Scaffold this active site. Structure first.
Site, PDB file in Angstrom:
ATOM      1  N   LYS A   7       0.835  -1.204   0.000  1.00 50.41           N
ATOM      2  CA  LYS A   7       0.000   0.000   0.000  1.00 50.41           C
ATOM      3  C   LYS A   7       0.880   1.269   0.000  1.00 50.41           C
ATOM      4  O   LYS A   7       0.621   2.235  -0.739  1.00 50.41           O
ATOM      5  CB  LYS A   7      -0.955  -0.029   1.174  1.00 50.41           C
ATOM      6  CG  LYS A   7      -1.878   1.203   1.241  1.00 50.41           C
ATOM      7  CD  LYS A   7      -2.878   1.067   2.403  1.00 50.41           C
ATOM      8  CE  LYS A   7      -3.871   2.206   2.376  1.00 50.41           C
ATOM      9  NZ  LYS A   7      -4.899   2.077   3.436  1.00 50.41           N
ATOM     10  N   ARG A  10       2.295   1.736  -3.546  1.00 48.25           N
ATOM     11  CA  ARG A  10       1.276   2.226  -4.461  1.00 48.25           C
ATOM     12  C   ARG A  10       0.915   3.705  -4.208  1.00 48.25           C
ATOM     13  O   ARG A  10       0.744   4.489  -5.150  1.00 48.25           O
ATOM     14  CB  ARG A  10       0.019   1.359  -4.379  1.00 48.25           C
ATOM     15  CG  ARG A  10      -1.157   1.896  -5.196  1.00 48.25           C
ATOM     16  CD  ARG A  10      -2.305   0.911  -5.221  1.00 48.25           C
ATOM     17  NE  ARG A  10      -2.839   0.745  -3.880  1.00 48.25           N
ATOM     18  CZ  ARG A  10      -3.754   1.514  -3.309  1.00 48.25           C
ATOM     19  NH1 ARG A  10      -4.281   2.553  -3.942  1.00 48.25           N
ATOM     20  NH2 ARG A  10      -4.121   1.255  -2.077  1.00 48.25           N
ATOM     21  N   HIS A  12       2.748   6.023  -2.517  1.00 41.67           N
ATOM     22  CA  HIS A  12       3.792   7.006  -2.298  1.00 41.67           C
ATOM     23  C   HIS A  12       5.038   6.927  -3.140  1.00 41.67           C
ATOM     24  O   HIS A  12       5.851   7.842  -3.050  1.00 41.67           O
ATOM     25  CB  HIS A  12       4.194   7.021  -0.805  1.00 41.67           C
ATOM     26  CG  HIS A  12       3.067   7.358   0.116  1.00 41.67           C
ATOM     27  ND1 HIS A  12       2.390   8.558   0.069  1.00 41.67           N
ATOM     28  CD2 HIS A  12       2.448   6.620   1.060  1.00 41.67           C
ATOM     29  CE1 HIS A  12       1.412   8.548   0.954  1.00 41.67           C
ATOM     30  NE2 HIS A  12       1.412   7.368   1.562  1.00 41.67           N
ATOM     31  N   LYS A  41      -9.053  10.912  -2.434  1.00 43.59           N
ATOM     32  CA  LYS A  41      -8.141  10.974  -1.301  1.00 43.59           C
ATOM     33  C   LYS A  41      -7.701  12.456  -1.153  1.00 43.59           C
ATOM     34  O   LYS A  41      -7.242  13.038  -2.132  1.00 43.59           O
ATOM     35  CB  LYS A  41      -6.938  10.072  -1.501  1.00 43.59           C
ATOM     36  CG  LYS A  41      -6.032  10.023  -0.269  1.00 43.59           C
ATOM     37  CD  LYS A  41      -4.875   9.034  -0.436  1.00 43.59           C
ATOM     38  CE  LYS A  41      -4.123   8.800   0.878  1.00 43.59           C
ATOM     39  NZ  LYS A  41      -2.827   9.496   1.006  1.00 43.59           N
ATOM     40  N   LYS A  66       4.089  11.988  14.130  1.00 44.36           N
ATOM     41  CA  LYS A  66       3.107  13.006  14.592  1.00 44.36           C
ATOM     42  C   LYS A  66       2.185  12.426  15.676  1.00 44.36           C
ATOM     43  O   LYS A  66       1.878  13.092  16.649  1.00 44.36           O
ATOM     44  CB  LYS A  66       2.305  13.546  13.401  1.00 44.36           C
ATOM     45  CG  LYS A  66       3.072  14.615  12.562  1.00 44.36           C
ATOM     46  CD  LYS A  66       2.330  15.251  11.344  1.00 44.36           C
ATOM     47  CE  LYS A  66       3.165  16.467  10.746  1.00 44.36           C
ATOM     48  NZ  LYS A  66       2.326  17.408   9.778  1.00 44.36           N
ATOM     49  N   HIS A 119       4.007   3.904   6.325  1.00 46.67           N
ATOM     50  CA  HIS A 119       3.207   5.124   6.263  1.00 46.67           C
ATOM     51  C   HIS A 119       4.103   6.293   5.927  1.00 46.67           C
ATOM     52  O   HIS A 119       5.299   6.301   6.263  1.00 46.67           O
ATOM     53  CB  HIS A 119       2.563   5.444   7.601  1.00 46.67           C
ATOM     54  CG  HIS A 119       1.585   4.445   8.086  1.00 46.67           C
ATOM     55  ND1 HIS A 119       1.752   3.773   9.283  1.00 46.67           N
ATOM     56  CD2 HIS A 119       0.423   3.998   7.552  1.00 46.67           C
ATOM     57  CE1 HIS A 119       0.726   2.955   9.469  1.00 46.67           C
ATOM     58  NE2 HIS A 119      -0.080   3.052   8.420  1.00 46.67           N
ATOM     59  N   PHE A 120       3.532   7.274   5.238  1.00 47.15           N
ATOM     60  CA  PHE A 120       4.196   8.548   4.967  1.00 47.15           C
ATOM     61  C   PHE A 120       3.723   9.538   5.993  1.00 47.15           C
ATOM     62  O   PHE A 120       2.536   9.902   6.025  1.00 47.15           O
ATOM     63  CB  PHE A 120       3.915   9.029   3.548  1.00 47.15           C
ATOM     64  CG  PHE A 120       4.779  10.195   3.137  1.00 47.15           C
ATOM     65  CD1 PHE A 120       4.417  11.495   3.440  1.00 47.15           C
ATOM     66  CD2 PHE A 120       5.972   9.967   2.470  1.00 47.15           C
ATOM     67  CE1 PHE A 120       5.250  12.539   3.079  1.00 47.15           C
ATOM     68  CE2 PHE A 120       6.779  11.017   2.094  1.00 47.15           C
ATOM     69  CZ  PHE A 120       6.420  12.290   2.404  1.00 47.15           C
ATOM     70  N   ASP A 121       4.603   9.936   6.900  1.00 45.48           N
ATOM     71  CA  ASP A 121       4.158  10.830   7.992  1.00 45.48           C
ATOM     72  C   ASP A 121       4.176  12.311   7.621  1.00 45.48           C
ATOM     73  O   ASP A 121       3.234  13.054   7.927  1.00 45.48           O
ATOM     74  CB  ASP A 121       5.050  10.601   9.237  1.00 45.48           C
ATOM     75  CG  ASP A 121       4.401  11.066  10.514  1.00 45.48           C
ATOM     76  OD1 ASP A 121       3.255  10.624  10.730  1.00 45.48           O
ATOM     77  OD2 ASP A 121       5.003  11.880  11.262  1.00 45.48           O
TER      78      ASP A 121
HETATM   79 CL   LIG Z   1       0.707  11.730   2.210  1.00 46.08          CL
END
Ligand SMILES: [Cl-]
Length: 124
Positions: A7, A10, A12, A41, A66, A119-121
């Site tokens: 995920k 896809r 990022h 999104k 965060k 994850h993209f923080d």
């Molecule tokens: Cl993002």
């Protein structure tokens, strides 16, 4: 179900270009990465570096996320990124995005074996 690592890839990764070359980049990429299928999104960042270089961030600078979790990492180098965010003209099924190209450090959350981005923080 898509794996967390898949995920992240896809949503990022865009290693095929050095940078966004136009204002329409986000409209095109948000559609093709299936980020507009059932709703738009709202915000999403693409990274224009190799997959290996983004994976490598998981052994770079450990920083807080965060949300207060401790599995975030900040790239030592700046990277080419594009932020995509919905504009006021955006209305599903006709999503519309502003494209903003920048060179910034990325911050990703990492998990698993192999220990990879999930994850993209943020960017800095
Ligand atoms: Cl993002």
């Amino acid at each position: 179900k898509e794996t967390a690592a898949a995920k992240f890839e896809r949503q990022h990764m865009d290693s095929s270009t050095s940078a966004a070359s136009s204002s329409n980049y986000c409209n095109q990429m948000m559609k093709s990465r299936n980020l507009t299928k059932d709703r738009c999104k709202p915000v999403n960042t693409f990274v224009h570096e190799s997959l290996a270089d983004v994976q490598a961030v998981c052994s770079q600078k450990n920083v807080a996320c965060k949300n207060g979790q401790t599995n975030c990492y900040q790239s030592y180098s700046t990277m080419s990124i594009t932020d995509c965010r919905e504009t006021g003209s955006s209305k599903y099924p006709n999503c519309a995005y502003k494209t903003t190209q920048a060179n910034k450090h990325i911050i990703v959350a990492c998990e698993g074996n192999p220990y990879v981005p999930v994850h993209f923080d943020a960017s800095v």
